Design a binder for these strands. Structure first.
Lengths: 54, 52
DNA sequence: AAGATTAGATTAGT
DNA sequence: TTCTAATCTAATC
């Protein structure tokens, strides 16, 4: 539906750099923080882990 | 970077017969053109968005 | 222009 | 059910 902002990006990375495989509870909280659907958060983490191993 | 005139000409005949070539079709084009497989796929992706 | 890359998303699946 | 791996589209160096 729309590109995400810089702040939303920064927040996901800060989370990403502490819990690379956030569980559903972690993902729902990030959803509320960012104003994104939970499904889009999951996709972000899946793609990010596939694109930045180690 | 930068493909030749001949390589371009060959790709269009293929594009106009198989617009979404699978790995086997794409691998054959690599040997035909002398290009890496990854660049042919990229070529097709760009061509389909710019020349449907 | 046209080649290359990035992000978001979808599908298939041991 | 969540994940990986390919791969597609759209948008952009």
């Amino acid at each position: 539906r729309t590109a995400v902002t810089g702040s939303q990006t920064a927040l996901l990375l800060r989370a990403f750099e502490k819990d690379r495989f956030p569980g559903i509870a972690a993902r729902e909280e990030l959803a509320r923080e960012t104003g994104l659907p939970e499904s889009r958060i999951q996709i972000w983490f899946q793609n990010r882990r596939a694109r930045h191993p180690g």
